[PDB]
Amino acid sequence: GNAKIGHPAPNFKATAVMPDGQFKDISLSDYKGKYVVFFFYPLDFTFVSPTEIIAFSDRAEEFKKLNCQVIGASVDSHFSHLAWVNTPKKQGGLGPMNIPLVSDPKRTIAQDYGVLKADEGISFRGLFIIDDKGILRQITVNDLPVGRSVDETLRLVQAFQFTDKHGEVCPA
Amino acid sequence: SGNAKIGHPAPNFKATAVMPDGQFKDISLSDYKGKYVVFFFYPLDFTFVSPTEIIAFSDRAEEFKKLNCQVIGASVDSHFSHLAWVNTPKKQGGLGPMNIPLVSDPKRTIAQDYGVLKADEGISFRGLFIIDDKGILRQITVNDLPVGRSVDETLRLVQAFQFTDKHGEVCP
Ligand SMILES: COC(=O)C1(NC(=O)N[C@]2(C)CC[C@]3(C)CC[C@]4(C)C5=CC=C6C(=CC(=O)C(O)=C6C)[C@]5(C)CC[C@@]4(C)[C@@H]3C2)COC1
Ligand SMILES: COC(=O)C1(NC(=O)N[C@]2(C)CC[C@]3(C)CC[C@]4(C)C5=CC=C6C(=CC(=O)C(O)=C6C)[C@]5(C)CC[C@@]4(C)[C@@H]3C2)COC1
């Protein structure tokens, strides 16, 4: 892919299902000025992914406190994303979301981020931390069966922000 | 770039390491087939963040031993530099005695193979790789230079890969 630490994270423009349940075309560059956690999950209607998606959504306030936008993405269609959002949580659905979920049906965003499982046309569990200038700071990629930690993601975002100010601080 | 791909054999290496007994030995990643491996890079010796990571992994080596998991650190520094850092007491800003080997990558080819060489500086990013007992790469972590890694998170991941291996074997 083209995701390189210290270089601008690859831009994308893609249809997402938004927290209000409607579809909107969004770009990574829309979020310049905020930190971004951009994470891929393989497919809708799966069993490791909902734990991750619901945790990032449930804890979106903690990322807001860090001026950090969270965005999920999968190769499944935005229609499929919304079907999973609208599925009752009691039956395995996501329920209402506090984060947008991007659709990557052409697989080009996953390829740009180096996380396409090429023999299977779905993304690995890639997670990318992008700073407020659009520069990639952190790459995380898990094989399909192993999920990610919101605690660890928050630790990383906060630590990048703190070290960002190392040298900018009042010298009293 | 690099050749580290999830689900493919992790790039082999053969390099001089400082072993836990304080002596030089040439080792290869393939020496550790049959064990999980946590293989991690740090930018250079005699720094500020890197020793806290290395000492944490060394101090907690027994927790990885209980998971049948070998931990190996690496940087582009010479093997003499590694040994000098080990021979410097923790009291005085060194590593002190180590429970893990420290690989020397002076030709930068291991860092290049793992896609973590920060070109134009000749040092590696904070790359961490989880390799299963068959030598297959399962997890990629790369941090920009200022932010360190978590041993807790690394153990969570190793445990989770071993957990899912119990039903995710390709062969019964
Ligand atoms: C960019 O514009 C500006 O900064 C303006 N000031 C300005 O240039 N000051 C100058 C001349 C330039 C900048 C520096 C060299 C650097 C920061 C500075 C040491 C410093 C840092 C940290 C504080 C401080 C005092 C507090 O009471 C405090 O709460 C905080 C948190 C002080 C101790 C006040 C002086 C200070 C601001 C000087 C002084 C121009 O109109 C505002
Ligand atoms: C498949 O080959 C065979 O079973 C033959 N038996 C054979 O080698 N038995 C022996 C000698 C004894 C049985 C064991 C110890 C156990 C299973 C085994 C590790 C293993 C398990 C799971 C696969 C495997 C390779 C694949 O390509 C695959 O799709 C699947 C799903 C392999 C990795 C091939 C070797 C394997 C079969 C060995 C090898 C009959 O022709 C050879």
Q: Where are the domains of chain B?
A: 8-169
By Cβ distance, the residue of A5, A140, A143 closest to B138 is A143
Backbone gaps in chain A, preceding residues (C–N over 2.5 A): none
Instruction: State whether the beta carbon of B147 lies less than 6 angstroms from ligand 2.
Output: no
Cα B8 to middle of ligand 2, angstroms? 19
Using CA positions, which residue lies closest to atom 26 of ligand 2? Answer: B171
Both structure tokens of B56: 């944490």
Cα A170 to middle of ligand 1, angstroms? 7
CA distance B132 to B6: 11
DSSP bridge partners of A140: A127, B141
Atom of ligand 1 nearest to the CA of A172: 33
Using CA positions, which residue lies closest to atom 2 of ligand 2? Answer: B171
Which chain B residues have any C-beta within 8 angstroms of a chain A C-beta? 6-7, 118, 125, 138-144, 146-148, 150, 153, 156-157, 160-161, 164, 168
The candidate with the shortest Cα–Cα distance to A46, out of A108, A113, A94, is: A94
CB B163 within 8 A of CB B67: no
Q: What approach was used to elucidate this structure? A: X-ray
Q: Who's near B47: CB < 8 A, 6+ residues apart? A: none
Both structure tokens of A155: 């630790």
Both structure tokens of A9: 């994270």
Instruction: State whether the beta carbon of A118 lies less than 6 angstroms from ligand 1.
Output: no
The candidate with the shortest Cα–Cα distance to B41, out of B109, B134, B135, is: B109
Both structure tokens of A78: 């935005």
Cα four-point dihedral sign B20, B157, B6, B33:
positive
Using CA positions, which residue lies closest to atom 33 of ligand 2? Answer: B171
Proximal ligand: closest to the CA of B134: 2
Token look-up 């996501």 returns: A94
C-alpha distances in angstroms, A162 versus A132, A165, B80, B147?
13, 6, 34, 9
Length of chain A: 172
Across chain A, the runs of DSSP E, i.e. the strands, are 13-17, 23-27, 35-40, 68-74, 101-103, 116-117, 122-123, 125-130, 136-142
Both structure tokens of A163: 């070290």
Residue of chain A whose Cα is closest to the Cα of B138: A143
Residue B106 gets which letter from DSSP?
Answer: T
Inter-chain touch A152–B147, beta carbons under 8 Å: no
Instruction: State whether the beta carbon of A146 lies less than 6 angstroms from ligand 1.
Output: no
The candidate with the shortest Cα–Cα distance to B6, out of A46, A12, A42, is: A42
Exposure pattern of B24-59 as b/e (b: 16+ CB <10 Å)? eeebebeebeeebbbbbbbbebeeebbbebbbbbbe
Reported as type and span, the H/E element at residue B81 is helix B79-87
* HSE-CB of B117 using CA atoms within 13 angstroms: 19
For A99: left if phi > 0, alpha if psi spans -120 to 50, otherwise beta; the answer is beta
By Cβ distance, the residue of A143, A155, A159 closest to B6 is A143
Cα A95 to middle of ligand 1, angstroms? 48
Rounded-to-10 torsion of CA B48, B156, B135, B121: -20
CB A113 within 8 A of CB A139: no
CB B7 within 8 A of CB B161: no
- Residue A94 — φ and ψ, nearest 5°? -75, -35
Proximal ligand: closest to the CA of B172: 2
The CATH number assigned to the domain with range A7-168 reads 3.40.30.10
Using CA positions, which residue lies closest to atom 35 of ligand 1? Answer: A170
Both structure tokens of B44: 């250079």
**Residue contacts between A and B (CB atoms, under 8 Å):** 62
The CATH number assigned to the domain with range B8-169 reads 3.40.30.10
Instruction: State whether the beta carbon of A167 lies less than 6 angstroms from ligand 1.
Output: no
Cα B169 to middle of ligand 2, angstroms? 12
Residue A61 gets which letter from DSSP?
Answer: H
Amino acid at A138: Q
DSSP bridge partners of A71: A38
